[PDB]
Input
Amino acid sequence: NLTKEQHEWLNGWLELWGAWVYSGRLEKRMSSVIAKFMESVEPGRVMTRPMCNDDDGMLISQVVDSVMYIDKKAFGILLSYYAHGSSKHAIASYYHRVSLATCRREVDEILNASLFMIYPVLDSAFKNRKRVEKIKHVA
Amino acid sequence: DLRPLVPLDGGRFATSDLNDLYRRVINRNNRLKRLLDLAAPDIIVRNEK
RNA sequence: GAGUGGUGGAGAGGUA
Output
């Protein structure tokens, strides 16, 4: 199949992308004042995941919008896996409840197929971009 | 959460008035409790009442 | 389970 360093590269990139698109919904955990100051004084297991500067996120959202218009179910499972944090066991049970092992099999192979379609267009979309240079002074 | 406690920008905590009022009545209720189980003189316990 | 604080309250001045 795909080599594993490309696999962890897409894992980190779509993890960062799902963490970016998860910070935009309205029905979300709003904290009080006291929990906010307890978190700023001594945190526990409340840590977050990195996001983008939203232009890289814009271009990768544009490429997944262009190629993933023909498949609704793969888009839905990559959203519910990358934004919420549900496991493939969990989304397999969630899709079987409304067998289950073949359901887990079909969701992982449609994830593999969607990743195989999104990878090389993502490499071309990465390499054909001009990096904006730092600020200079003319005398 | 209807007599809330958000601090100021420099870490100093600025409350509502109700927390102060409840602090006063709770502290004097504790002192009246101490004087009733201490069995204080009647002038002292009626002054705290 | 994935960023964040003024409203609170006072005083002073201003607009329609």
